[PDB]
Amino acid sequence: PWRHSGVNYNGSTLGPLEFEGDTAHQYRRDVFRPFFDEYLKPGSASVHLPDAIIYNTGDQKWDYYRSWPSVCESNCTGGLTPLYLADGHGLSFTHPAADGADSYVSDPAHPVPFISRPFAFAQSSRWKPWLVQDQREAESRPDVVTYETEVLDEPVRVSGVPVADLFAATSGTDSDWVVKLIDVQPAMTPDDPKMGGYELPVSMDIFRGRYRKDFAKP
Amino acid sequence: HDPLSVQTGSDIPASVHMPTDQQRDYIKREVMVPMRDGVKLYTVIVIPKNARNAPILLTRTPYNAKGRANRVPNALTMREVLPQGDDVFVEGGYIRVFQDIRGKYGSQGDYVMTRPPHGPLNPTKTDETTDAWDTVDWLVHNVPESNGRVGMTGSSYEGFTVVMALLDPHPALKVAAPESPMVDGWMGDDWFHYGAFRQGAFDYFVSQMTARGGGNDIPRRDADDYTNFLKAGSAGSFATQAGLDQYPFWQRMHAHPAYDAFWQGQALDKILAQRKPTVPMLWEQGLWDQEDMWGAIHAWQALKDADVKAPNTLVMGPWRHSGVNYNGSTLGPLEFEGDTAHQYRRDVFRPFFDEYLKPGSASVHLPDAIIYNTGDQKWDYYRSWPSVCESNCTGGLTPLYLADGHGLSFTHPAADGADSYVSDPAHPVPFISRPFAFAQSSRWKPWLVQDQREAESRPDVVTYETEVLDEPVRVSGVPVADLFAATSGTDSDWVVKLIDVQPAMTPDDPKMGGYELPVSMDIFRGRYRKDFAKPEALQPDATLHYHFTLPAVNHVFAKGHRIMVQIQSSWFPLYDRNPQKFVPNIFDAKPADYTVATQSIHHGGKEATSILLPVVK
Amino acid sequence: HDPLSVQTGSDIPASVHMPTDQQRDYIKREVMVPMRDGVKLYTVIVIPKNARNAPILLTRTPYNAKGRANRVPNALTMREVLPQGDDVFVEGGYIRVFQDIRGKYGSQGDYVMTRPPHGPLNPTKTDETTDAWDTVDWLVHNVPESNGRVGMTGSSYEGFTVVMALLDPHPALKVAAPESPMVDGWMGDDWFHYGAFRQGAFDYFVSQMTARGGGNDIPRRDADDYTNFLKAGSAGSFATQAGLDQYPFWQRMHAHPAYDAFWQGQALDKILAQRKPTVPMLWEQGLWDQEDMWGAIHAWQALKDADVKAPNTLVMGPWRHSGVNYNGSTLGPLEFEGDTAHQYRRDVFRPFFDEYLKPGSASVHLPDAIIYNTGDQKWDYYRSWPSVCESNCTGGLTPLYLADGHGLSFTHPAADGADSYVSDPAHPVPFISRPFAFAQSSRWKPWLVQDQREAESRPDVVTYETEVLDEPVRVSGVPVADLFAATSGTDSDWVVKLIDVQPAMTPDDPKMGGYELPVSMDIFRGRYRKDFAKPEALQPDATLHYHFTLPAVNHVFAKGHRIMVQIQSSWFPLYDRNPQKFVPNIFDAKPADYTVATQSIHHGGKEATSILLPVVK
């Protein structure tokens, strides 16, 4: 649960998020070091690492996966589960039979700030944890379409690489597509009030439309 | 059984009498002062130990008079027992009186939210004026340690009472100083701002009206009030869900969405001017008064217009609402030259009050208005103010026009043009960064000085700016929004902001680099363009002319800065969203009512939008 | 007249029907549960909406039950309305019950500070044990959504009511988990620590005993309590000036400064052991518990010795007092591996309770003690704990002797020597940096983890230390202070501190460099050397043997660190100053009684001062 190069520092927190102990040190001492020791300090105890050792940002613990990922698009044990966008600005695992579309106006004269203004690239203090920043500002904008599921009854578990299956049209001849997978915190978090309703992005990325068919030939 | 070991009774004393009380430097007197109609009011008299003929400082409050005089509960010294703002009056040996208004906390009788003065709205033989009058009468005949002289003061509702008292004061009331008073709750004070509803009220309602004494807030689902109010829908939808529908005042408010007879009968600025008070007055309000921006300035001027034969000075510092009674050395990221609040309280407030409350004290001669210059960072003493205005002033206003290329210019642009922006009610512009809950006093208080860069970055907001200044522009007075806006819908809200863009870089204070600091901004509900009393639908796609006053300025746009004007059509969640479709009552707007509209602000030509700036030399 | 315009009544509604309640996911039942003596007790019952066969988690408190179940007043969710430490039980769907103890707030009857159990000290037909019995009895017969099973818990006074309940529980009480419970107020819990009085008590008295419900604090003269108490002189003199002389409990305490029959009749740890109970218990207390360090560990141990035939697990995390019901990730500058508090609640607390309250739940097999290792930074599950102690343990304690050159050695120094320091009562050592007021909760809470470097710099504090460790030293158990000290006066206090000196440099966290973190420290009142019940004057200049237990440890002194021992004779203003001259009752010490003394701590030889460390492998 670290930011870039976060492994070589402290891993207890990232932005407003809080994790279980120094996750960075944890790895350095329990996995990194012993692993290196095996091959570098002859006579050392050998380690048997799995495919992936990943921290769970939901369960708040380390997950040891013998074979990861277990689900994916091609060749994995299982397949990905499509979370469909639906009318009413919602999300459902049940493919909406009816056709539909929601629109927004992307005005380049007023581009969406990736993080609250004002930001200068020199502000490392702001650049480092920008990926866990609250996505509520964007939501309040008319140039950002947003969809959400109903307050979860039972937890939904995810592990692997999410894929954006997006069917979008632009009135222009080019366009960038930013997709953000977000975990909205509970409406109210009495133990830590500031987190109440916090729109925390677990995964997001941008895609330049001009490379839709060939990254090599725009 | 030996009582020193075995206890059968209760470890709680049956009656206390702690020596802590003899170690004090004051005396607290509690008394149910009876009003003419037989209703008694809870009154706290804080008398400095060994007080021979001391003036009384009276304050009537709906905010628990006991606690008001208990900054530090049962403090050993008066200075700690009384609020921060009483420091000069404590230093001067004044007697302090805090009274629970009729209906609240310790007092008896019925409580009526900002009880309208005796008239069409209040036919009873009692009001906030008589009660004040009676109290003063009782106070001068029941405090031997006092000198029979009474002064009145207080902020917000505690100032609203000073005004109500000024309508028909008691001979004893020698001097009054209303601070950020609740004068016109519709025009631009606490409830509405030019017809636009302030959703912060709902809480206050359930807070001050659920019970005689302390109450509670409205339980929220989400931590962000932006979400709370939007997910609810219309302002009335919230009130209903909060059960406010069962609160008498809300019912009255909801019944009168326009500036009808109900609200006009409470316009204390006009009513006070009709009575022509003869008692010396010291009107105070903050330049960034986020709660009662209309009150003081309007009352002072309305009296100035009626030619009152009495001291009538207006004081405006670099403070937020009620900021005068605390420390005024800073507000938000802004920094001023010293504790401006204490500054005024010691060098003006006190001396002025001393003149009429302490026989023999030096006499002061305050100018029309003493205002803090947020540009030069110094106190300005204006003999006549303002010098520049629309009509009846020495000189007129200087229009700063909107021009092509989203620029601002003092020269009337001949080229006719327009700039459009889509206002989607589904995504209203956050008045301050998200998330925000009305309960966040911390965030609320200085919201008026926050950076406007976030808003600027949105496509549903239009921004205009002058070039980087090469010569400073001095403004002192009330700027006017000369708006020529057009909307696709049949209704709209118009937020106009006058901003001072800080230097692109401020190496002494990096954080302020290119900071968009609003010196004056307000909202205007389009349906009231023609008449506040008679709301009327706007003609779709038609360029309509709006003309309204923005909060007063006493600022300087220094070199390196820029003047900036910002226009938008929402301000969530402070103001309820205008459905952009004309409806009989916006409080009862339905999901289908809220319509996405296209706004176009016309610049240049005959319909040239601009800010009529009070430019001075 | 038109009502929607004119109000003649009160804007305050007669009743209210807030629809917020319908949105809530729980219901609150307020019941006046009647005890066996006719006295009824206020009882807030929080029931999860649509509950069936739900266990009841009960807490009896002298701290306003209504407010206890109102973390977020009238919250829409139970998780919000209940305290942080209820999280695991709210998630489990437990019925939460908070009851006002007899004599407090909503409850009827008389209040008796920590009402002594039935016996010589309390002859009446009732007590906190019966009230609990009566309460549980009612609960299991009037809460239809409950399965009849009840678990009792609470911290501090709220944990004290749990212990009282365990003296003679109702058959429905299936499990108890006292948290940092008030067990022996004289020995080392809340009032005294080995006879030394804690001046924090005075505020507590006036605050918790002035009235049935809420009370207030004692008005101070100075903002610094170090000054406040020093100026007043003796603790009793302060109490007198504060006006505590009229409170029955204070009188009884003042009349029993020694460990006489009055306090021995309250020693719940010994009393509970005499009763041989059979209810599964899970004792908890913080390793750095600054309010009730004696309680849990002693009561738990007493039972273990009494060969109790029921689950008896002790839990000690890296928390401050009552820190178990909050977030336990940090403590002052210290940082632990994740929320240690939450960890325990989810992984141990609830599962344990689930076993006996939710039939069909898996059975947990807790060891003797689950202590958090403050050195390794991980939870330790000790099957048999401690493994080392003075009498009847697998192994004994290893002494860390005081040596010459102000060092600490594990090797018994043959050379006889002594280091002396002057203890001037007019300049007592601040238990934490000045200024400090008892009202400063933010400073009080984590005072036991503060840097001891300040003390070290004082000419009235002897500091000893090992050489920077090349091998880590693991300690797990209860360290004993084997003190051979000598004072020139006829009385004296002895403060012994066991400190872990951080590495001289900590590049990853620069502020921890050379930090002197106290893992365990306490104070002993000299006059009680021979007998806690019979105070005796000390012989001037005589090397006397003091032997008392220090707070339990489960730490590890790693490479780079040093073990440190600090000894002083005062701890102001937490502990009233010892006059250093034997007086019949230190509470009533007169100005002249206070005498400057010369303390001499002997090291090595036959009288080798040391800390009997519980060193393990």
Ligand SMILES: N[C@@H](C(=O)O)c1ccccc1
């Ligand atoms: N342990 C807390 C408590 O029980 O709340 C306390 C008791 C007595 C005096 C001061 C504090």
